[PDB]
Structure 1
Amino acid sequence: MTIAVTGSIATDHLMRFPGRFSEQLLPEHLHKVSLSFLVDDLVMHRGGVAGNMAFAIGVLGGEVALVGAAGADFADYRDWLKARGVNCDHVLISETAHTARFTCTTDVDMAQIASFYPGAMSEARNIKLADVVSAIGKPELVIIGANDPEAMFLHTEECRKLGLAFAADPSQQLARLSGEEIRRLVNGAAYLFTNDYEWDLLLSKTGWSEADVMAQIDLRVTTLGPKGVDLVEPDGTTIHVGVVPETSQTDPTGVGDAFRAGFLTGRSAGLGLERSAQLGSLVAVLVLESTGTQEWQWDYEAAASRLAGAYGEHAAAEIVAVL
């Protein structure tokens, strides 16, 4: 039943400046700035695409192993994930580098100053999926999430060699990879996940037609924001599922990851394509409506009720029957 989730593990450190950055950005000092901002809030969110996906699968009660690279400062995050049933045995802990980190300071005018530190993520290229197989047997599915790029290639190649089904889930790496690199991530995938902007980017960079892609994969999953999700099979069957209506948009971060987790959890639990997309749509809206990416709650009763509103009582009952 085990899904192995590969990809980035990171935290976001968000700081608020009550002033305006522009007050310190006069031309006299742009050649060598020395900016200092007294900030009045610091929020830390657990993230990375693999952390987000593993967290969600765990919360939903799926069998899941997180496979990525982090630093010694990962310990409290490990305990957090382990509390939700995530197997973290195969998280590579760097001896020298800290866990990847996004830091962002935002002022009162919503100007931002941001950095990204890859840290230990770069060591994901040293993880061998064979070591996972030795400990837990062959995963039912390996998710190839956004990561150290070399690690994405090596993991995908190892999946093919070892006969492991994989999901191509390159998300924000599509912009950075060459057309050939993207083809190499997609050939033979059990699933391809993207949003609709990324789907178009994929076709233009690779030079593939849609038919060429569908000759390579078992299922295309293309998210459409508020317009739902398209699922396309290589036989020409298409399924479209609408969203669960939201009651707020407190933070859109992590929504794609959440969709994927819910969908794949549904598939692993034996649900059909429509029902799995419905489940993914619920998890996605819970993440949309909450701060950060792993700060949402899972309430069986509220899930059943909300699913029934969006998709009818019959569909809701079919879905919660497996949770």
Structure 2
Amino acid sequence: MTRFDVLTVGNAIVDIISRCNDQFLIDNQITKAAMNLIDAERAELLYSRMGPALEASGGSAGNTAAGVANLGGKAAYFGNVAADQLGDIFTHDIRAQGVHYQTKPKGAFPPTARSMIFVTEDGERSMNTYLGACVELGPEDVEADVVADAKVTYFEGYLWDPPRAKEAILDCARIAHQHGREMSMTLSDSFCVDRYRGEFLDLMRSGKVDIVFANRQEALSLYQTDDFEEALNRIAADCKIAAVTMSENGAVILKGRERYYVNAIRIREVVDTTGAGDLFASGFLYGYTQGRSLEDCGKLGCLAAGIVIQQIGPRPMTSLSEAAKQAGLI
């Protein structure tokens, strides 16, 4: 018996969420459905144009860790906040979900990362992220005991933007594999993949990553192709297990020559897609660390994702474990 099912590592972010029209994205040159990196000046600018907002703890890997705990798994998280009110919110929210979170802030400046997330009428989300204190995440923040005692260590593609986070990730990979654990990543965003395409391929091909998460857009970007079938064939060749999501078209889990397709749950209405991919990973990884079939992992992932997209905010406010029990996924 270990200490953790899943350790996640990512950019520790508080979300600032508002509804907007499609014209707002165009007028502000915000790339729809993407993670748009912004500096401090642009952050003030966009905020000044944003309507009344709601704040909620975010960060892709943070959301995933929270989702694992919610389901009943044992989660830990590495991510750097500042010693400020946003950092205190982030710290409270993830710990309150029962995620082990011990990353120490290094002062108040730069301040805690925030992402201004604009949700259009179709429920799509477009994020505008000032990384702030995230740029300080480094090897010093790896709790080696936690990596050793975690069945899976999962991290964001997004970690390739700050300068030193990749160094922590390579340390994690070493420790995890020396202790017989597995490493997992998400490709995070199609433009993120475009920035670090060769780096991500090498992580998979070198065996530093055992399990990869992608959506259709990320898979297409990875191989710079318009052929989804090609992308699936190539991603299966590059990593031991790939979990590929296709929004309303469900998901497909790849392992060698095996493909396992899973239906998407039918939705009342899509309120806010923020966190869908993150909570797919929560469901998948919770299932995987419980020894479940790859199809059942995919099912648990789709259930979590379906729930999160029917609420405002990236972390389900309801019990995922109760939802899983009702679904016979238990």
Could you say which TM-score interval applies, normalised by the shorter chain? 0.7 to 0.9
Q: Which moved more, 1:191-200 or 1:7-16?
A: 7-16
Question: Which protein shows a greater Rg?
Answer: 1
Compared with structure 1, are the counterparts of its residues 262 and 192 closer, same or farther at alpha carbon in structure 2 (3 Å cutoff)? same
Once the two structures are TM-superposed, the CA of residue 15 in structure 1 deviates from its matched residue by 5.2
Partner SS state of residue 297, structure 2: helix
RMSD of aligned alpha carbons:
3.5
Aligned partner of 1:191 in structure 2 is 211
* 1:174 is aligned to 2:216: no
Once the two structures are TM-superposed, the CA of residue 250 in structure 1 deviates from its matched residue by 0.9
Give the Cα–Cα distance (whole angstroms) in 2 for the partners of residues 304 and 221 of structure 1.
23
Q: 1:227-249 CA distances to partner (integer Å, 9 max, x unpaired)? A: 11111112x11100101111111
Aligned partner of 2:105 in structure 1 is 93
Give the Cα–Cα distance (whole angstroms) in 1 for the partners of residues 159 and 78 of structure 2.
12
Q: Relative contact order: is structure 1 or structure 2 higher (C-alpha 8 Å, sep ≥ 6)?
A: 2
Once the two structures are TM-superposed, the CA of residue 11 in structure 1 deviates from its matched residue by 1.2
Is the 8 Å Cα contact of residues 168 and 185 (structure 1) preserved in structure 2? Answer: no
* Aligned partner of 2:12 among 2, 6, 9: 9
Give the Cα–Cα distance (whole angstroms) in 1 for the partners of residues 269 and 220 of structure 2.
29
Aligned partner of 2:83 in structure 1 is 72
Structure 1: any 5+ residue segments left out of the alignment? 26-33, 308-315
Partner amino acid, structure 1, of 2:59: G
Is the 8 Å Cα contact of residues 146 and 152 (structure 1) preserved in structure 2? Answer: no
Is the 8 Å Cα contact of residues 223 and 230 (structure 1) preserved in structure 2? Answer: yes
* 1:120 is aligned to 2:136: no
Partner SS state of residue 297, structure 1: coil
Is the 8 Å Cα contact of residues 125 and 148 (structure 1) preserved in structure 2? Answer: no
Is the 8 Å Cα contact of residues 153 and 185 (structure 1) preserved in structure 2? Answer: no
Give the Cα–Cα distance (whole angstroms) in 1 for the partners of residues 68 and 93 of structure 2.
13
Partner amino acid, structure 2, of 1:81: I
Aligned partner of 1:29 in structure 2 is none
Is the 8 Å Cα contact of residues 17 and 55 (structure 2) preserved in structure 1? Answer: yes
Partner SS state of residue 150, structure 2: coil
Aligned partner of 1:258 in structure 2 is 279
Partner amino acid, structure 1, of 2:300: L
Partner SS state of residue 140, structure 1: strand
Aligned partner of 1:224 in structure 2 is 246
Partner amino acid, structure 1, of 2:106: S
Give the Cα–Cα distance (whole angstroms) in 2 for the partners of residues 281 and 102 of structure 1.
25
Give the Cα–Cα distance (whole angstroms) in 2 for the partners of residues 209 and 40 of structure 1.
39
Once the two structures are TM-superposed, the CA of residue 170 in structure 1 deviates from its matched residue by 2.5
Once the two structures are TM-superposed, the CA of residue 300 in structure 1 deviates from its matched residue by 4.7
Structure 2: any 5+ residue segments left out of the alignment? 29-44
Give the Cα–Cα distance (whole angstroms) in 1 for the partners of residues 214 and 119 of structure 2.
29
Is the 8 Å Cα contact of residues 8 and 146 (structure 1) preserved in structure 2? Answer: no
Aligned partner of 2:224 in structure 1 is 204
* 1:157 is aligned to 2:170: yes
Aligned partner of 1:102 in structure 2 is 115
Alignment of 1:282-301 (within 5 A): 282-298=303-319, 300-301=321-322
**TM norm structure 1:** 0.78
